[PDB]
């Protein structure tokens, strides 16, 4: 709305590697996340196809399409409730203390639903899981929602 | 452990000493509804993750920014130098030093 | 340029300047090469070294000539710093295909053709990205050790 | 301030005061930095060092300025004294979680956030509280050794 945030246009100049002021359709998922929006990858996929837009063939962009797609994704930020994120992992391990065994969270984050690479899974556990093999998800989900 | 995943009704089944028990076609119906309900619940929980996942990649990419350059330029030098008289000289000589 | 690296270039300047007056002339170049075993060092090699400078080779002209050729020179401790961040679990030499993918996909300086030249005298282990450390040695001091 | 530490500051005062008159002026600061390899040392850095004093930098003004910045400076033998009392059986570097709990639970200076900053350049072993001794080195003489 501007509140006209012109820093979204300045961040589009940091993600366009050619400097022509266009951003390919394959970068739009990760740049919506870098502007403070977490649409799921199936949602980013649907919307695209919904608009008869094929992410399979070469794509370019213009700021005039990327701005309204970020504004259509911005209504879905009401789905980001931290009660359900901590209660999900509290149902994932027994006893009254928030600890996932290391390999349980790593294999679930790579193979269940939207596949996260094991390189990204190791980069998200690095520091929050110590050598006991127990990830405290009270501080883990706190630090994941700090970015 | 397997049933851990899936946007499936975690109700409709039941385990026991030699086997699992499963509904169809009602309980079958239940689950289905359930299934959709996790895509929601799930699909949404996936996203953030996905999102978040790459959000850490940027923090790494960025860190890396210079360490590369350092590496980048640094090599190039050598490729140029290693063929230079003066540099070979310094090389044989570099040891006699203290 | 760290100060111990500048003191190493001051010691190399004193070993090539055998007249000890502060300016390496062509006679100093030839007598340093003859003391290393080069009895056949041509005058055209000495003239090509002097043709890289605009004036006499005093200590600051030798430092500026080496600065302009070594604009990406990195000491062994900072190269091992970056390779310990690439192998953050320690000890292991990193895979060949991991260094080829990460050089290309991050930067234009890590493009492939250049990666074939990296494997080409930096041998297999070095090239591959498995060993480590010998490449830091030969980037700070060239030729086979 | 022990007397050998004051003699170390007298030797550092004589190496920065290259005019040997007893007062470090801005020309001494610039010529000591140029002799360490700093050819690009700006005049604003020299002015910010002189702006920390109310008068000329003689030996007692340099000692009082260093005293007021190092009001908790501890020599390496007293830091190893305290770490030998934390590891009273000798040899072993103490656990990471033991130093985090004992810093917090005894004092307010050992609060966590500060403990994350301790781990942050004082690396793992140091941060963790396992090694020992390298942290005493870098507290008496900074930067990576």
From Swiss-Prot, chain A:
Q: Which UniProt keywords apply?
A: Motor protein, Muscle protein, Myosin, Repeat
Task: Say if the entry is tagged with keyword Acyltransferase.
Answer: no
Query: SUPFAM superfamilies, alphabetically?
Result: EF-hand
Self-association state and partner proteins as the record states: Myosin is a hexamer of 2 heavy chains and 4 light chains.
Q: What is this protein called?
A: Myosin light chain 3, skeletal muscle isoform
| SMART domains noted in UniProt | EFh
- InterPro entries this protein is in? CALM/Myosin/TropC-like, EF-hand-dom_pair, EF_hand_dom
Provenance organism: Gallus gallus
EF-hand domain mapped to chain residues: 7-38, 41-76, 80-115, 115-147
Give the CC-aspect GO terms. contractile muscle fiber; myosin II complex
PTM comment for this protein?
Answer: The N-terminus is blocked.
Q: Does the keyword Repeat apply?
A: yes
Q: Which residues cross the membrane?
A: none
Molecular function (GO) terms for this protein are: calcium ion binding
UniProtKB/Swiss-Prot annotation, chain B:
Superkingdom, taxonomy of origin: Eukaryota
Region described as Hinge: spans on this chain: 93-95
Occurrences of domain IQ (ranges) = 38-67
Q: Where in the cell is it found?
A: Cytoplasm, Myofibril
| Region listing for Actin-binding, in residue ranges | 14-28
Residue positions, PTM Pros-methylhistidine: 10
Assembly state and interactors? Muscle myosin is a hexameric protein that consists of 2 heavy chain subunits (MHC), 2 alkali light chain subunits (MLC) and 2 regulatory light chain subunits (MLC-2).
* Job of this protein: Muscle contraction. Myosin is a protein that binds to F-actin and has ATPase activity that is activated by F-actin.
Description of its domains: The rodlike tail sequence is highly repetitive, showing cycles of a 28-residue repeat pattern composed of 4 heptapeptides, characteristic for alpha-helical coiled coils.
- The protein in question is named Myosin heavy chain, skeletal muscle, adult
Q: What is the lineage of its organism?
A: Eukaryota, Metazoa, Chordata, Craniata, Vertebrata
Of the parent protein, the shown chain spans 747 to 844 of 1939
UniProtKB/Swiss-Prot annotation, chains C, D:
Biological process (GO), any one: muscle contraction
- Which species does this protein come from? Gallus gallus (Chicken)
Q: What is the lineage of its organism?
A: Eukaryota, Metazoa, Chordata, Craniata, Vertebrata
Domain EF-hand: start-end pairs: 9-39, 74-109, 110-144
Question: How this protein is processed and modified after translation, per its record?
Answer: The N-terminus is blocked. N,N,N-trimethylalanine, found in other myosin light chains would not have been detected in the N-terminal tryptic peptide in PubMed:7358336 because it would remain trimethylated and ninhydrin negative after hydrolysis.
Provide GO CC annotations from the record: cytoplasm; myosin complex
Can the keyword Aminoacyl-tRNA synthetase be found in this entry's annotation? no
Question: What is the official name of this protein in its record?
Answer: Myosin regulatory light chain 11
Q: What Gene Ontology molecular-function terms does this entry list?
A: calcium ion binding
Keyword annotations for this protein, in alphabetical order, are: Calcium, Metal-binding, Methylation, Motor protein, Muscle protein, Myosin, Phosphoprotein, Repeat
Summary of the function given for this chain in its UniProt record = Myosin regulatory subunit that plays an essential to maintain muscle integrity during early development. Plays a role in muscle contraction.
Q: Other comments?
A: This chain binds calcium.
Q: Which residues bind Ca(2+)?
A: 17, 19, 21, 28
Section covered of the full-length record: 29 to 164 of 168
Quaternary structure note: Myosin is a hexamer of 2 heavy chains and 4 light chains.
